[PDB]
Write a protein that binds this DNA or RNA. Structure first.
Ligand SMILES: [Mg+2]
Ligand SMILES: [Mg+2]
Ligand SMILES: [Mg+2]
Ligand SMILES: [Mg+2]
Ligand SMILES: [Mg+2]
Ligand SMILES: [Mg+2]
Ligand SMILES: [Mg+2]
Ligand SMILES: [Mg+2]
Ligand SMILES: [Mg+2]
Ligand SMILES: [Mg+2]
Ligand SMILES: [Mg+2]
Ligand SMILES: [Mg+2]
Ligand SMILES: [Mg+2]
Ligand SMILES: [Mg+2]
Ligand SMILES: [Mg+2]
Ligand SMILES: [Mg+2]
Ligand SMILES: [Mg+2]
Ligand SMILES: [Mg+2]
Ligand SMILES: [Mg+2]
Ligand SMILES: [Mg+2]
Ligand SMILES: [Mg+2]
Ligand SMILES: [Mg+2]
Ligand SMILES: [Mg+2]
Ligand SMILES: [Mg+2]
Ligand SMILES: [Mg+2]
Ligand SMILES: [Mg+2]
Ligand SMILES: [Mg+2]
Ligand SMILES: [Mg+2]
Ligand SMILES: [Mg+2]
Ligand SMILES: [Mg+2]
Ligand SMILES: [Mg+2]
Lengths: 50, 77, 247, 112, 63, 91
RNA sequence: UUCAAAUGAGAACUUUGAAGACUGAAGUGGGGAAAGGUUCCACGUCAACAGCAGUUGGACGUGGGUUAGUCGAUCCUAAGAGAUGGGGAAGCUCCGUUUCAAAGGCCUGAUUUUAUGCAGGCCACCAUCGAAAGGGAAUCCGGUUAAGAUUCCGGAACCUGGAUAUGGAUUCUUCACGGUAACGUAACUGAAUGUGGAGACGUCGGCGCGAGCCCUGGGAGGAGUUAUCUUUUCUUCUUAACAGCUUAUCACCCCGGAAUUGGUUUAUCCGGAGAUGGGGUCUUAUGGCUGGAAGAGGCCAGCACCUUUGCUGGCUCCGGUGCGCUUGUGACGGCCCGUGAAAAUCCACAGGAAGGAAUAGUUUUCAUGCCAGGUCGUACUGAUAACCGCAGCAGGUCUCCAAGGUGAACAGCCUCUAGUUGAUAGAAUAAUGUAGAUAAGGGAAGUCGGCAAAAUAGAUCCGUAACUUCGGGAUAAGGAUUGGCUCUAAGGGUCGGGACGAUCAACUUAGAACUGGUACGGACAAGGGGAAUCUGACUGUCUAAUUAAAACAUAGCAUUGCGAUGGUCAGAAAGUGAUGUUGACGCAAU
RNA sequence: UGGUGAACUAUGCCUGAAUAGGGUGAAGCCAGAGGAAACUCUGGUGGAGGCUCGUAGCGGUUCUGACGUGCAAAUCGAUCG
């Protein structure tokens, strides 16, 4: 809103830091079965609902 | 900012123990009939206010300049 | 099969009175020692309009007998009362318009207003514009006074009940036709949410006892008894008679 | 012609958000937010504006000296100098009338 | 500017060029206010100069 | 010149609401907008603020009166009755 | 939409230039509120996504970016919400918001190792939450980034809280003096308590004034046109918060005593309750001058040039006009059975409790000086792609600023500043379509029905019937005129003076001559009318998404109940509620 | 049976905001005329109205137009209030 509560800003900061692809070295781990970030969130597709 | 018209007041104001800097500014005010003259402005920086004394005569300008205290840091133009 | 409008009014959600602009409750002074034994003089500072009230209000200042200060009282202004007038309230107060006197301290035929039903209730009778109570008799044996009320009813009141000499100001107000819906609108937006009114016969049966039918008609007697229950009392409740009086 | 914008985040024309257009030393037009105009102090008796009292917003009265807020007279910055004159005359005349009233009462109590 | 000069010279003001009513183009109240202000200014000027006395001034003011 | 034959101030209402209602309103609006003698200062300067409130433009006296007239006939009768009763009690 | 160049493996779509257009200032511009949440910006980059394509992107990958004592929140209260005391409920919990309660904190004595000891009253206000548009302490200008700025830098201010010295002021008439007065000032003691003011308020109408804009003259620069004409067309010529002096309609004061009544507004109010007049006092909206401040910003001209990148010089001035537009404001006027918030907060006055006098004896709302001002928000979009609608959806979504012409006009049409040139394209012009049009003669014969379309249309001047609630009907009906050009007349302000003259300035109206393929509200824009019947009085309202109506409402009329131990209505109950901040000219039910 | 909704919409309340230019011309006021008296009349001024033409806004009459596997689970255009 450009006038946001600190609680909203803190949630937005967490979402911003979470918004990243899978680290590549994860795939090389022994017995790894994670292929991509399945919880990837984008601002044009899914709204985070506060 | 505040204008000072009394040279005696300006003299006491230049030694107020909180004023440290002053600026002497030269303005050309030229016209064909009224006056093509040279005006000087003595600006003293006080703690809360800037005091300006306007002198339209060069004789008084130089007298005040040489009457300024030595501890006062003076900028020209 | 649905809760009807007159039933819904009692929950008082959208049907409360609109009191934002009102000057305060209009009432007499608290009956104290000074009014009980002598009189106390007040000064009319203002005659002000009150939102939602036809009658104007007099704002009267009295001195506090026990602490150094002034006390404001909101009286209902009687006809003739003016700013700067002195008001006298008490047992020994004079018989002048605007003065507050016990009903036992006035002769028969006296015209009073804002009359207390019981001594100390600070005014309950003859409060609307142009209304008054007539003192018609005294019974000093039982300390009682007979009065005629605005409705024509005869009443017996304690002679210690107080009243204000005169008639409530603002009379003749209802003699002017409103002429249009908007004036009724502005009249009731300062009072409460009772306007406009939908006729029961214009509704469906679910909404009103008068609802429904292939013509608009009540279909059963509109005189409803006293013992009817909520949702049934729509029409002429406990009507002793109906129709135009004198043919 | 150069058009302007509100300088605060209030986008509505409320009476606390009034502006006027000024020209800056930069040569451009700019909005300037203007405070609500002050109301003159009024007499406590008649309600007319008090002569010789400065017109400020209520908090600004704590900044100026006493000279701006009063007049050199009884009820200086609260009454209008005709109401003060009326107060003086009414007080003197009613006090004299009280003396007359009690002298008359003392005279008429000697009839018996 | 050329059209404005022609309008000042009186052109383009015939019946075929007017689309608003006469009131809309120039209010009759504005015309009356100008006329009455001229008359009152003249009457006051004459009274203050002494060409007329206050009784003649009052009659002329009313009429 | 004569601008209306009979509607007077009710010409603002045009042709609606009916002639009888407009005439009834006419009488009360003429009363309500009339200027009245001030009993205190003696000048034709009393006008209605709101229904029942009558203020003099000079001397600033405000008096409680009728909704559309300064004094109602019932109020005048009440004043006469109160004066008669007070004088009878005093005599 | 087009041409060319650049880039690229690849260009209808990317970038640059050129051209052609559009939005045309209730914008396709510049900002914001809700909402979103990084979409902002840079670099790399095109597998997926983009109604085709793609080297581009609100995509993908990696990072950078949001700086406040003064802008908000934070504080106040609004309609309301809601603990406590207490009552109800098996109970989850419900009522109620000051109540049937033993419901608290101010100053002053203070030995300042240290916090208190007894004093004597001070209202009785009952928690708290409730507004990023209501109230409210205080900041502006210039510059600066890839992206931040009223927050950063430079300069210049202001408020609050605190501390505190000097100067000034005052005092041996202790707590100032002047003015007839309205009142004036650099100050010029003042507790409890009380009173008053500000905060603090509708709407509309014309009038006055201000500001910004619009228009315009002269001059000092720059650019365009220049076959011809054009002392020409375009453009720069600016001045913040704050401060000092000054400046006002209204209001008030002194003198004076008015009929031959006078003064006076566009609007008819005012005067023996003291007018006109003469002279004064005051609010400082607002404007002027000065400081701030030319040192800034703007526009140019000469040299040097990626050597941190510059340097040097000049000018930046003086006028006019107004039913102009937008906006602020003042004094008024109209309207109401409508009279159009509250609190925090600040100040003044009344009162007189205490305290205070001679090389520092008090106090200082006077000047200057010292210190500090926390927390959270701050990027961007705000929509034919950043919100909601399953989406990059022709829908929906609050608000500020608003140039020139035409014209009554924020209408339509064209243009300037700014912005955009986006929506798959190429080729060809069958039928049938959708949208836009035209039509000989007839003129509603069509059809359920003139549906649809056409006709009318602006303005000026003529001329207007029945009927009517006398207000209307009415633009009734029905006619004439309208371009261009050249003129003519009327309608003003100042100043001279002690009967006109001289100067300055608008745009309305009327008339005449001439003129043309008889055209002329030349595009745009813009009533069809009349005679009757049914029906609802009218204005208004409803079936969001098949019904706008004769349906609902309405004023008016009538009836019914009720005097509070009450009528009507609510609740499981209640020491519980709505009407009710009410009282028959009222509330409730029809 | 126990819960969740008044971000849509219905209604009240509180606090804000928004609404060109024209037509008509109520009261009040000023001047004048006719009349023996009653009294009547004219010209101005003024700017009223849940008046009127008509923008923005609000709405949704008709084409029973477009669309009707839509731009859209209610929209588009014109005509309208
Ligand atoms: Mg979305
Ligand atoms: Mg009804
Ligand atoms: Mg029905
Ligand atoms: Mg029944
Ligand atoms: Mg505010
Ligand atoms: Mg006009
Ligand atoms: Mg007129
Ligand atoms: Mg293309
Ligand atoms: Mg593609
Ligand atoms: Mg971008
Ligand atoms: Mg990215
Ligand atoms: Mg603030
Ligand atoms: Mg709060
Ligand atoms: Mg920015
Ligand atoms: Mg700074
Ligand atoms: Mg920011
Ligand atoms: Mg921003
Ligand atoms: Mg932004
Ligand atoms: Mg297209
Ligand atoms: Mg044909
Ligand atoms: Mg033909
Ligand atoms: Mg046929
Ligand atoms: Mg047929
Ligand atoms: Mg048709
Ligand atoms: Mg007809
Ligand atoms: Mg429907
Ligand atoms: Mg809602
Ligand atoms: Mg209307
Ligand atoms: Mg329909
Ligand atoms: Mg269809
Ligand atoms: Mg449609």
């Amino acid at each position: 809103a450009a006038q946001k509560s600190f609680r909203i800003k803190q949630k937005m900061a967490k979402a911003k830091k979470q918004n990243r692809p899978l680290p590549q070295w994860i795939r090389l781990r022994t017995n790894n079965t994670i292929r991509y970030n399945a919880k990837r969130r984008n601002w044009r597709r899914t709204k985070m609902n506060i | 900012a505040r204008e000072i018209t009394d040279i005696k007041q300006f003299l006491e104001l230049t030694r107020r123990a909180d004023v440290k800097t002053a600026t002497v500014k030269i303005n050309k005010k030229l016209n064909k009939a009224g006056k093509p003259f040279r005006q000087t402005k003595f600006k003293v920086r006080g703690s809360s206010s800037l005091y300006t004394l306007v002198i339209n005569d060069a004789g008084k300008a130089k007298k005040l300049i040489q009457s300024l205290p030595p501890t006062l840091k003076v900028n020209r133009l | 099969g649905r809760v009807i409008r007159n039933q819904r009014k009692g929950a008082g959600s959208i049907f409360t009175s609109h009191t934002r602009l009102r000057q305060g409750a209009a009432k007499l002074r608290t009956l104290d020692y000074a009014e009980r034994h002598g009189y106390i003089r007040g000064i009319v500072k203002q005659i002000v309009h009150d939102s939602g009230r036809g009658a104007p209000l007099a704002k009267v200042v009295f001195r506090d007998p026990y602490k150094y200060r002034l006390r404001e009282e909101i009286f209902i202004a009687n006809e003739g009362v003016h700013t700067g007038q002195f008001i006298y309230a008490g047992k020994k107060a004079s018989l002048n318009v605007g003065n507050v006197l016990p009903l036992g301290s006035v002769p028969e035929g006296t015209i009073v207003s804002n009359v207390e039903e019981k001594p100390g209730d600070r005014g309950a009778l003859a409060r609307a514009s142009g209304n008054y109570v007539i003192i018609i008799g005294h019974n000093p044996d039982e300390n009682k006074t007979r009065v005629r009320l605005p409705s024509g009813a005869k009443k017996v009141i304690s002679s210690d009940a107080r009243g204000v000499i005169g008639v409530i100001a603002g009379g003749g107000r209802v003699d002017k036709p409103l002429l249009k819906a908007g004036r009724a609108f502005h009249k009731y937006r300062l009072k409460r949410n009772s306007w406009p009114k939908t006729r029961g016969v214009a509704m469906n049966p679910v909404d009103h006892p008068h609802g429904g039918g292939n013509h608009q008609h009540i279909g059963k007697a509109s005189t409803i008894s006293r013992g009817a229950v909520s949702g049934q009392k729509a029409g002429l409740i406990a009507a002793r008679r109906t129709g135009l009086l004198r043919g | 012609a150069q058009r302007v914008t509100f300088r605060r985040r209030n986008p509505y024309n409320t009476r606390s958000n009034k502006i006027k257009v000024v020209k800056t030393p930069g040569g451009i037009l700019r909005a300037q937010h203007v405070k609500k105009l002050a109301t003159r102090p009024k007499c406590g008796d008649c309600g007319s504006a008090l002569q010789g009292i400065s017109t400020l917003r209520p908090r600004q009265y704590a900044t100026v000296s006493k000279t701006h807020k009063t007049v050199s007279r009884a009820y200086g910055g609260s009454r209008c100098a005709n109401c003060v004159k009326e107060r003086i005359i009414r007080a003197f005349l009613i006090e004299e009338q009280k003396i007359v009233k009690k002298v008359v009462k003392e005279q008429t109590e000697a009839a018996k | 500017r050329a059209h404005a000069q022609s309008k000042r010279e009186g052109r383009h003001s015939g019946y075929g060029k007017r689309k608003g009513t006469r009131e809309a183009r120039l209010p009759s109240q504005v015309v009356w206010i100008r006329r009455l202000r001229v008359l009152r200014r003249l009457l006051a000027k004459y009274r203050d100069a002494g060409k007329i006395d206050k009784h003649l001034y009052h009659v002329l003011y009313k009429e | 010149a004569k601008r209306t034959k009979k509607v007077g101030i009710t010409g603002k209402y045009g042709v609606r609401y009916g002639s009888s209602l407009r005439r009834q309103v006419k009488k009360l609006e003429i009363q309500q907008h009339a200027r009245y003698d001030c009993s205190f200062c003696g000048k034709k300067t009393v006008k209605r603020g709101a229904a029942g409130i009558w203020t003099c433009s000079c001397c600033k006296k405000t008096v409680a009166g009728g909704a559309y007239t300064v004094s109602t006939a019932a109020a005048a009768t009440v004043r006469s009755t109160i004066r008669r009763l007070r004088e009878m009690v005093e005599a």
